[PDB]
Write a protein that binds this ligand. Sequence first.
Ligand code: MGL
Ligand code: MGL
Ligand code: CA
Lengths: 707, 704
Amino acid sequence: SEKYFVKNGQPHFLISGEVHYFRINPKLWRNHLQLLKQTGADTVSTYIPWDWHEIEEDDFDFEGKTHPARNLIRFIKLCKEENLDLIVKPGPYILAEYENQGLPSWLLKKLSKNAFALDENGNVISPDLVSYLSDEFLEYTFKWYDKVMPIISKHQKEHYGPITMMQLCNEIGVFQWLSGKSDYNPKVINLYKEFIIQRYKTIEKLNSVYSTNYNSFDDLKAPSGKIKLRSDYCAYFDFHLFFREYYNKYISILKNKIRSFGINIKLTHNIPGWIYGNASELPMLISTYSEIMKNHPDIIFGLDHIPEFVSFRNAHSDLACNKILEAMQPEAPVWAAEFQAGTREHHVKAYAKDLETFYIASLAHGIKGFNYYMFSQGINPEGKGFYGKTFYFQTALDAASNKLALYDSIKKVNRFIRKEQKDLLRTNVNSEICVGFYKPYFFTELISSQLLKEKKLNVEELGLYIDPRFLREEILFNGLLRGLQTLNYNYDVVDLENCDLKSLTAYKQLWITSAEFMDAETQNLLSEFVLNGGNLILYPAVPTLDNYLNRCEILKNNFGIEFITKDSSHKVSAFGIEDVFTAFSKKQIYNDTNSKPIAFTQENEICGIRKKIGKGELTILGFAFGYTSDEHLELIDKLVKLNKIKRELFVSDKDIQFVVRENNKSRYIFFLNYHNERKTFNYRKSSEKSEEISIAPFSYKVIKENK
Amino acid sequence: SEKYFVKNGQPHFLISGEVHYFRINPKLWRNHLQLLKQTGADTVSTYIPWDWHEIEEDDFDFEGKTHPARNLIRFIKLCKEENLDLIVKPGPYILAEYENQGLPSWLLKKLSKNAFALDENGNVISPDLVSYLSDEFLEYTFKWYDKVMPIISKHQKEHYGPITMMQLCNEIGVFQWLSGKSDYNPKVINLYKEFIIQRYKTIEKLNSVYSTNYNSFDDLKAPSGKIKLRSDYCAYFDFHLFFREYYNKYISILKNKIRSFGINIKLTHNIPGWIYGNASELPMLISTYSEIMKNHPDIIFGLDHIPEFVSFRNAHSDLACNKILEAMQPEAPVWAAEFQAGTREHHVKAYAKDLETFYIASLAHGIKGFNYYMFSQGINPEGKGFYGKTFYFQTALDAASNKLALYDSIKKVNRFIRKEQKDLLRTNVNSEICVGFYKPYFFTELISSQLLKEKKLNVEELGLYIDPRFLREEILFNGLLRGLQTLNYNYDVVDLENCDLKSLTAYKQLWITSAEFMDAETQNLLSEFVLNGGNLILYPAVPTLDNYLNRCEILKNNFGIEFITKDSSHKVSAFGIEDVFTAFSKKQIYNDTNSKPIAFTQENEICGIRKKIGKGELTILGFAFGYTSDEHLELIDKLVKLNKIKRELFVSDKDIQFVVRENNKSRYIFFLNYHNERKTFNYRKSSEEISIAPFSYKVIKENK
Ligand SMILES: CO[C@@H]1O[C@H](CO)[C@@H](O)[C@H](O)[C@H]1O
Ligand SMILES: CO[C@@H]1O[C@H](CO)[C@@H](O)[C@H](O)[C@H]1O
Ligand SMILES: [Ca+2]
């Protein structure tokens, strides 16, 4: 049932370390590789920077002719000699705190303006930010691939070389996201027009969906400026759908090019989204890859985990992220393409004692492989550092190959993994709770995000009150998911798109955080779920619109719900819990028809009901809550207990996090203390003296049981 | 030298605990007060909520006639019996997560529209947000004072009673901050017009400053919307000055009313600005009280410190805030009116072991007193909480007076403070570095802040490239102040407004973080400073404009500086440090006649010089750096060493922070470990081997 890497037909935990040959004295390459191997790591990972190897236009060095550390060929040979497999990452973008994100200076000086990402005014957004489908950009990228790809092809595992995997480019859209502006390049605009014409066929059909009055497709322009009408929302929704096809076109072109060199190894891509040590926006960025993941079953996405510290302030980010990757990529192992080791920034410390706990928590949280980023510190040669001379701090090795404090933490974690990987990789958590991932709520990177310079989406101007970004960040990511993890209830996340009823009916409960809009397909799937025997928890709104904000009352009518939206105090009572603070004055007030009222406004109006519908159960709460008070954890606990869901352990300290993982042979108990307190507690299995445990601040214990 | 509270004619560390009688079972009031006194606390602090006591219009309950927890009189008698002094805070605003921010529901229902703060369209901003100078609001505020102030007068220290201090209202302007919305109430706008007429006298004078085309003051509208033109920046700048006068008018009306009751005790106000565990915006909030602090030497401002956690991620916030308060309030002790104890937010943990370190670091960082907020948890009466039933978590005591983990930390820190206060309170750090506080850069709460989401200020539309909030947050607060503290170099901050030349001449170096604009008085002050023998460090720009963005090149011409602004790579070299990352492509390239070039672009153009001017020295860098690389610490260290400034100790571990505090007799060395690492290190001056746990401290005393 588990998805894991396999080596020689056996479960294999992928343990990689990032070692940048181009930032290490080549006389010390072998020492870095040997010391990585000695931690039990099986793989090494590096970028191959285009700027580093195409030293001038059409002048290539991969053999150290012009600089010893340009000898890629010798680095590849050393990996094979030191029995490490190799992950190569030739870009064209590498980011990697490298000048111009890895693109050659000579290229950026030569490209015309139309090669660059442009704002709504036609101005260059950033001097190192290209437009991905720029003709000029792809012509130069292809000429770079013509030189680096024959080397990668020759050194593949199938030809007895060390190369097992290759990353295509780096965090597609990360540069656009961090710039705070979207790409209005004329290639984007023209491709968008073709997309719209293919989608709608006639202007009359587009006008009927948008409620616009265009005479022809020629009158329609890519949406710019703030959303003031539902028709602007519709245009931006289609723009989001278009950018997912656009990123799929980019990675398809790179992949087709690469395959033409006889490169048959596993292709990877890496998911950005952590910033300031939390990952609440990563679900938005992963959502931009929806069409790539649908179209390329042979590209494995891995996470870029950058926690920076390990405390209750960010404990939920890594689990939520691992769960959402699983939902969008159910057929591949969850793994971290970049797994924080040291710090990319001197002023943002990375303590070995934090990261060691992160590594263990990641195993508890179901990670199946990772690449320590950065295992080895680098020193940038020849002024190539974006931000300074030194690349990373507080790593496993310094640039000179000296062991630092983190080395012994990685050796300890890797030792446990190698001893246990045969069983541990095959273990599952018993999740009786499924949480719905409704991708369209995440499609706002053009209009609403933590990074976007201009807020383009104000839902109040559309006569709505439930902002999809507020819902998915505060009600879902920081709310329900944070709540369930804190309460030690296992959950899975399932992508609702083309979702199998069969793959929902194994859960005791399905939880749906709903806005006022939801497509007909999803409204029909949730209806069938309940009619057929499913138990559904749905808040803060019964939706009544589709993704284009047109009438769609399928779920409301199938559930026999009548409601009015009324203004009241933020506080409600729910299941006998008084003074539950809710996010909105407006709430859904339900008729008590064929239902039990279980939530009341300050005027005792019904804002939550429970009902039996066909063979199923429905609980609706017409109010929004995340986790910003103790009442919210009480409410989540009450809702879970409606279907008699029990934690796996009784633990005497509610602030201790645990995960039980098991298969037929083995049970692993992970205890995680995310708090600055030495905690002494006792526990027992919820079905039969209690064991006592002492756990340091920001620390962990792992217990293995045979059977 | 030092400013400190006094008790029995000796230095007194003010140790207060916040205990909300109105949120606590009255049967347990005496228990709470006894457990607070048993920590060594000398004072207890509480709101007196207007909503809680004026239960209906003109119906007052201070004796528990209608609810036992409305017996304020009995709470005051218990403070007296348990030998605690009392800080009272009657509002009218209390915030304190209290419904309507403490204003009666009956008041908010009955006020006219024109009593409320209005957006530019004349719409009510928030149904609990009144206009501070609303006639109706002040009428009802005065009637609340008429009942609560005679009780406070009767029990005040000037009549021997337990009440030693009173806070006026609560965090004035905190609602214009949190929303970014200014009050456009017609009475406010009429006051803004009076301010402008009074300031410029004639429309011709104002037109010449703003470059506007008005025929009269009748044509003048309050600024709104985004700044597109230099004339809009000018109008918004005076709108900022106006709000500083407005808040001084409000707090003066409250103060005159209070004094009319014969209340002669110390009056207080509290400074907001921490959010998400850092305080980089608090300097903006303190700048809103510039006119109050100028005109009321008798009102003591205290800080509201909410660190949430204690690490290198926020180590610099509390010191920078304490140093800025000292700059703006040199004649009163630096203290925390609200000093984090527990957490306002269940999901935002406050570890006893973090706050214990924060408490000791605060002593290192010059705090002279504090009020643990919240010492006691509260239970909101009858749904009167803004949020849920419970007020604060992980406090010293829960609402039922159960001791929690923080209690023992507070008792430990208080025992240390009581043992040392006599000598500790009279100690200062030896600062050879002075950092200038130029308040106009901070006057942006209406146009540019962490809490305004739609920014009205885009300096590129004005032909500028150095944004004053970016400068004061990233180059000053998180850059230079963070770097000096990390390097363990003492600094003082000085308010440049009406600044005495003599109070700059004690320092070996004055550091000025400058945008492209600076008023004639500050340009003149800095010119004189260097000519008379001062050492000035100035970056990232020689200013060429005044606060109205009109030409002003006093400093530039007095120092014989010429430059062109040119685009280059972000990285420069400076004092032989290669690859210094700078904020801007645009840099000042200096004519090097009679100068030494000390910084270079990637094309080797001169973006920094040193120069002798009269008896003094000038170091100008035409590029902006904060602290985002090891080269930035190397550059700060090189700059400090230009005038041979030394740290007080050699400590073997660079990541240990220390503060040396001395007077003639006593030295305290505070070692602070802001890192998740047990650190062993040794130290010696400029048995010497020491171990400190993660996120922990050690204090060493040396007799001199
Ligand atoms: C500039 O580097 C990028 O920064 C983002 C914001 O922290 C991260 O989400 C990405 O994983 C990282 O590659
Ligand atoms: C709403 O409560 C206020 O919140 C601000 C934002 O965190 C703080 O700066 C203030 O001190 C606090 O009183
Ligand atoms: Ca000159």
